[PDB]
RNA sequence: UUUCAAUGGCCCGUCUUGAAACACGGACCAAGGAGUCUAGCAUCUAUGCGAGUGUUUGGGUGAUGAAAACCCAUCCGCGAAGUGGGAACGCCCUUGUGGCGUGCACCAUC
RNA sequence: UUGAGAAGCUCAGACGAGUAGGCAGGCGUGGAGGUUUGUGACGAAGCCUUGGGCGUGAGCCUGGGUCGAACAGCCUCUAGU
């Protein structure tokens, strides 16, 4: 249960929070867990995605790939993985958007940036 | 009452002295696989109830 | 070793039978009475 | 006993506050119905459903 | 709301009803056949009886109420005018706190309808009484 | 012990017949100069209390039985004792998971299933 | 011999506390009325929580053959306090309980004779009944207590020479046996019980002076 | 279910009118569409307490939603200000029959 | 003899038009508290049907088809029923 007055329990404030967030809140939005070598090393359950992260895709149709993010999609809140696509009528492939939460990070894309966020996050390297 | 317990009939019996133990309530007996004797076990421990 | 046959039980017991005494005695007496009466 | 007190005592946290009282002491109908008081003096009860 | 049941929803009402319902087949007393014609009937046909009338009417003329119970299917209040409270037996279906400590406390006992249909089932020796009616 | 219903027909309502915006549900006639409520000849016939079924052959089945609405194993295992006067009846939003269970269930009971074979088929 | 014990929730602590008390009522000491109206509190709730009947059968029979081992001198108040107790919670029990407690009263009906014959031997008959004859009239029989129920007199008219008969198999000897109904059918302010017992009560007259 | 045969069967609602005649409303279907909320008063019933009764203007308090529940200081409102018949009961005793008493509520008589 | 939802069970007789109006018991709808250790992607709700059944009736249960994510029985509360 919720005890702060200043959280909203309600669906309608929440659906209209969720779809109507910002670019900045989208990133935090779509955050992926890590893999469980990446978790018991760096200390930290999940994290944002970013393009070149390695993941694996977990659940769906496509459960079992790998592969780098090409491109994360937040106005769909998906990501685009490469080799992870679909064929279309004239043959050309059309990716297929992935839900954040769906996939899992077996190799980061270590940035200064990133590596200050693991130390900040009760993390280690 | 009777009931069955997989594959065995027992007497379920409760009394009014033990209405506020929930655990304890209910008391337990085999009813034999013998018709006969079932009815007769029946008889002898419901003795003297309506 | 043996139940003692609850006290309410031989309570009802007397009174059925004084009960039962009545009805005996009152369809007794009916019977000799009705077959006086039909002769009537 | 003090949040609700007793039927003759009052309650310590509810100021003259005594707990309610039943309109039947003992509230086993068949007790008294089916007791040696009532069934010594009551008629011999006819029959239940009676023959047509 | 009179005739053949109790508009009372409470349950201990239609317990006694229940209990006189036995009481007024099965035993050929008005007693019984009075006490259960006035457990139906509504508050408005049960007034109050204070402890007052109950101690004039048992000690009337004669008096000689010996012990008889009073009996009341109503509430039996209390009268703080009179000052002396004499010893009493009165069954009711409800006594107010002050009449029940002061009919204890100044000699005898209150009783309920069940615990008189144990002593009297046919109310024998009772003194059956109303309050009046006019208001 | 035999079935009798004083009336098979159902009780239309009146000029239900003549308007598909008066529906078949039966409505008293509150109309005074209605032909209908007065019972004339060759009126129809409206719901009277004559009409209602022996007390104790109501709710029966023609087959004798009385229905009993079944949602689990649970309610079918109510009916060990009733098994000659009632008939279990699987409801019509219970899966077909749960359907085949109720009436293996009901078998092992005695107790007849008035839709036993419902979005199910068999294989010997 | 504490009465909280006696009334625990559980008959292994129930039993152990009866027997801690059997040597309590045997003490050289004058144990006042409240004493042992308290002490009957604890008994009565350990024979309410009596669970199956042979237990209840044998644990009466515990309670009964208690009076004997009470002191001589106190022993009319151990009997005259369990009527007291009997009388104001009869009432109060179920219709699945009284079975259970007829039983008791029963059994301390008969531990009365049987106290009354045994007293017989040293001491003279007539003094010893007398002695009883009071308890019975200022405690059951009396006639200005209009709240003890009938249901226990009646029992113990039904049970009354049948239970003096137990006491004396071979005969009974000359005594005030029925003064205590006497008393009441002649002067008791119940005309339900006074029109009644006389019914219930089956006196022998045999041995009794003819008035 | 459709259809046939035999027998029967004037269009519904409103108003009118003994009655109808009437005059009105109705092309069809879907959805919407009319005794509601609140303040006061009176009867009745239920419930609580009862010569009392009513916590919620407010204060205290309430960590798990704290607009709830729980508690009540001072006021105040409204209330308070003999003879007959007879319910019921006991006692009889020719026992039923009736009589002898005790007499509620209420109605008649002072 | 088991037939005590004593609010049950049971026996008997008479009776049955009905406007205004009086009274009683029921059917259905939206939402609320409780409950069914309730139903549901192995198909909820809805709709369709010369499928079947129950009730004097309001109505309710169900098969088949269609369909695609919620929903109901029981006690009580409530009303833009």
Same mark, same amino acid.
């Given at each position: 249960m919720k005890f702060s007055r200043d959280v909203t329990s309600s669906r309608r404030k929440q659906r209209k929070a969720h779809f109507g967030a910002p670019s900045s809140v989208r990133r935090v939005l779509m955050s992926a867990p890590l893999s469980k070598e990446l978790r018991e090393q760096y200390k930290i359950r999940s994290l944002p995605v970013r393009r070149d992260d390695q993941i694996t895709v977990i659940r769906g149709s496509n459960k079992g790939r790998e592969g780098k993010i090409?491109?994360?999609?937040?106005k769909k809140f998906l990501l685009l993985i490469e080799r992870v696509t679909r064929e279309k009528a004239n043959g050309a492939s059309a990716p297929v958007g992935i839900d954040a939460s769906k996939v899992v990070i077996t190799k980061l894309h270590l940035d200064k940036d990133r590596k200050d966020l693991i130390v900040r996050k009760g993390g280690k390297v | 009452t009777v009931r069955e317990d997989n594959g065995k009939l027992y007497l379920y019996m409760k009394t009014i002295e033990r209405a506020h133990f929930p655990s304890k309530l209910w008391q337990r007996i085999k009813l034999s696989k013998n018709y006969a004797k079932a009815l007769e076990q029946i008889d002898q421990q419901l003795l003297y109830w309506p | 070793a043996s139940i003692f046959a609850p006290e309410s039980l031989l309570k009802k017991t007397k009174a059925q039978k004084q009960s039962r005494e009545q009805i005996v005695a009152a369809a007794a007496e009916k019977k000799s009475a009705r077959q006086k009466k039909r002769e009537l | 006993d003090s949040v609700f007190g007793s039927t003759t005592e009052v309650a310590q946290l509810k100021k003259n506050y005594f707990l309610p009282e039943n309109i039947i002491s003992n509230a086993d109908v068949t007790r008294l119905i089916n007791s040696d008081e009532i069934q010594?003096?009551?008629?011999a009860a006819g029959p239940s459903r009676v023959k047509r | 709301s009179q005739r053949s049941k109790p508009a009372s929803e409470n349950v201990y009402l239609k317990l006694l009803v229940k209990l006189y319902r036995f009481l007024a087949r099965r035993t050929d007393s008005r007693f019984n056949k009075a006490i259960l014609k006035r457990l139906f009937q509504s508050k408005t046909n049960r007034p109050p009886i204070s402890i007052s009338k109950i101690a004039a009417l048992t000690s009337?003329?004669?008096?000689?109420?010996?012990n008889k119970t009073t009996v009341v299917v109503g509430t039996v209040t209390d009268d703080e005018r009179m000052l002396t409270v004499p010893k009493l037996s009165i069954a009711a279906l409800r006594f107010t706190k002050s009449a029940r400590a002061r009919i204890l406390k100044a000699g005898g006992e209150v009783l309920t309808l069940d615990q008189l249909a144990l002593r009297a089932p046919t109310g024998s020796n009772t003194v059956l009484v109303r309050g009046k009616k006019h208001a | 012990v035999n079935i009798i219903k004083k009336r098979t027909k159902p009780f239309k309502r009146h000029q239900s017949d003549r308007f598909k915006r008066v529906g078949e549900s039966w409505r008293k006639p /509150? &109309?005074?100069?209605?032909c209908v409520r007065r019972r004339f000849r060759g009126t129809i016939s409206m719901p009277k209390i004559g009409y209602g079924n022996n007390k104790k052959t /109501?709710?029966?089945?023609?087959?004798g039985l009385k229905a009993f609405l079944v949602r689990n194993v649970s309610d079918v295992e109510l009916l060990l004792m009733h098994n000659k006067t009632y008939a279990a009846e699987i409801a019509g939003n219970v899966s077909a998971r749960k359907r085949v269970e109720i009436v293996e269930k009901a078998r092992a009971l005695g107790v007849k299933v008035?839709?036993? &074979?419902?979005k199910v088929r068999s294989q010997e | 011999p504490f009465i909280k014990k006696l009334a625990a929730n559980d008959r292994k602590t129930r039993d152990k506390a009866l027997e801690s008390l059997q040597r309590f009522l045997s003490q050289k000491k004058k144990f006042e009325r409240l004493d042992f109206l308290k002490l009957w509190k604890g008994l009565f709730y350990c024979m309410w929580m009596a669970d199956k009947p042979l237990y209840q059968q044998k644990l009466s029979d515990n309670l009964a053959a208690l009076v004997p081992i009470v002191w001589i001198d106190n022993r009319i108040l151990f009997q005259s306090t369990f009527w007291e107790t009997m009388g104001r919670e009869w009432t109060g029990i179920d219709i699945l309980r009284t079975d259970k407690f007829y039983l008791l009263m029963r059994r301390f009906c008969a531990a009365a004779f049987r106290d009354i014959q045994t007293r017989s031997k040293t001491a003279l008959l007539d003094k010893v009944v007398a002695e009883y004859n009071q308890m019975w009239m200022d405690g059951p029989f009396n006639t200005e207590n209009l709240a003890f129920p009938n249901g226990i007199l009646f029992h113990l008219a039904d049970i009354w020479t049948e239970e003096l008969r137990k006491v004396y198999p071979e005969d009974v000897p000359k005594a005030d046996w029925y003064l205590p109904f006497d008393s009441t059918i002649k002067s008791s302010h119940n005309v339900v019980l006074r029109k009644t017992l006389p019914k219930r009560l089956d006196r022998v007259s045999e041995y009794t002076k003819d008035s």
């Amino acid at each position: 249960m919720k005890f702060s007055r200043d959280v909203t329990s309600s669906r309608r404030k929440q659906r209209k929070a969720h779809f109507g967030a910002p670019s900045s809140v989208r990133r935090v939005l779509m955050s992926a867990p890590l893999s469980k070598e990446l978790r018991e090393q760096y200390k930290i359950r999940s994290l944002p995605v970013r393009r070149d992260d390695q993941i694996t895709v977990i659940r769906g149709s496509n459960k079992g790939r790998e592969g780098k993010i090409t491109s994360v999609y937040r106005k769909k809140f998906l990501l685009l993985i490469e080799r992870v696509t679909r064929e279309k009528a004239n043959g050309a492939s059309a990716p297929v958007g992935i839900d954040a939460s769906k996939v899992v990070i077996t190799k980061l894309h270590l940035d200064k940036d990133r590596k200050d966020l693991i130390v900040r996050k009760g993390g280690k390297v | 009452t009777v009931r069955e317990d997989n594959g065995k009939l027992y007497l379920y019996m409760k009394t009014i002295e033990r209405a506020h133990f929930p655990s304890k309530l209910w008391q337990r007996i085999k009813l034999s696989k013998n018709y006969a004797k079932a009815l007769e076990q029946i008889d002898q421990q419901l003795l003297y109830w309506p | 070793a043996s139940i003692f046959a609850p006290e309410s039980l031989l309570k009802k017991t007397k009174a059925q039978k004084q009960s039962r005494e009545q009805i005996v005695a009152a369809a007794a007496e009916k019977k000799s009475a009705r077959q006086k009466k039909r002769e009537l | 006993d003090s949040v609700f007190g007793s039927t003759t005592e009052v309650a310590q946290l509810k100021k003259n506050y005594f707990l309610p009282e039943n309109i039947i002491s003992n509230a086993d109908v068949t007790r008294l119905i089916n007791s040696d008081e009532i069934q010594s003096i009551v008629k011999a009860a006819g029959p239940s459903r009676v023959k047509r | 709301s009179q005739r053949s049941k109790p508009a009372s929803e409470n349950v201990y009402l239609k317990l006694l009803v229940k209990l006189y319902r036995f009481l007024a087949r099965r035993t050929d007393s008005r007693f019984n056949k009075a006490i259960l014609k006035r457990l139906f009937q509504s508050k408005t046909n049960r007034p109050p009886i204070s402890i007052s009338k109950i101690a004039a009417l048992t000690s009337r003329k004669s008096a000689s109420s010996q012990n008889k119970t009073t009996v009341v299917v109503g509430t039996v209040t209390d009268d703080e005018r009179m000052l002396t409270v004499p010893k009493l037996s009165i069954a009711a279906l409800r006594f107010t706190k002050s009449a029940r400590a002061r009919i204890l406390k100044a000699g005898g006992e209150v009783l309920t309808l069940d615990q008189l249909a144990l002593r009297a089932p046919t109310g024998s020796n009772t003194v059956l009484v109303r309050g009046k009616k006019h208001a | 012990v035999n079935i009798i219903k004083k009336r098979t027909k159902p009780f239309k309502r009146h000029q239900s017949d003549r308007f598909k915006r008066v529906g078949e549900s039966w409505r008293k006639p /509150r &109309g005074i100069d209605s032909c209908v409520r007065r019972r004339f000849r060759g009126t129809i016939s409206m719901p009277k209390i004559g009409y209602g079924n022996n007390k104790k052959t /109501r709710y029966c089945m023609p087959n004798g039985l009385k229905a009993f609405l079944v949602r689990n194993v649970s309610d079918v295992e109510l009916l060990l004792m009733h098994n000659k006067t009632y008939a279990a009846e699987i409801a019509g939003n219970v899966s077909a998971r749960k359907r085949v269970e109720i009436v293996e269930k009901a078998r092992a009971l005695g107790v007849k299933v008035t839709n036993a &074979g419902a979005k199910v088929r068999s294989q010997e | 011999p504490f009465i909280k014990k006696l009334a625990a929730n559980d008959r292994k602590t129930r039993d152990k506390a009866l027997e801690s008390l059997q040597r309590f009522l045997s003490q050289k000491k004058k144990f006042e009325r409240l004493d042992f109206l308290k002490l009957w509190k604890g008994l009565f709730y350990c024979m309410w929580m009596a669970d199956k009947p042979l237990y209840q059968q044998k644990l009466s029979d515990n309670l009964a053959a208690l009076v004997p081992i009470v002191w001589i001198d106190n022993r009319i108040l151990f009997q005259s306090t369990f009527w007291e107790t009997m009388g104001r919670e009869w009432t109060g029990i179920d219709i699945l309980r009284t079975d259970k407690f007829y039983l008791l009263m029963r059994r301390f009906c008969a531990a009365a004779f049987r106290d009354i014959q045994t007293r017989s031997k040293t001491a003279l008959l007539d003094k010893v009944v007398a002695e009883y004859n009071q308890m019975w009239m200022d405690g059951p029989f009396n006639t200005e207590n209009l709240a003890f129920p009938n249901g226990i007199l009646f029992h113990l008219a039904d049970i009354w020479t049948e239970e003096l008969r137990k006491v004396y198999p071979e005969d009974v000897p000359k005594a005030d046996w029925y003064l205590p109904f006497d008393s009441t059918i002649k002067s008791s302010h119940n005309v339900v019980l006074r029109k009644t017992l006389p019914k219930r009560l089956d006196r022998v007259s045999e041995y009794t002076k003819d008035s």
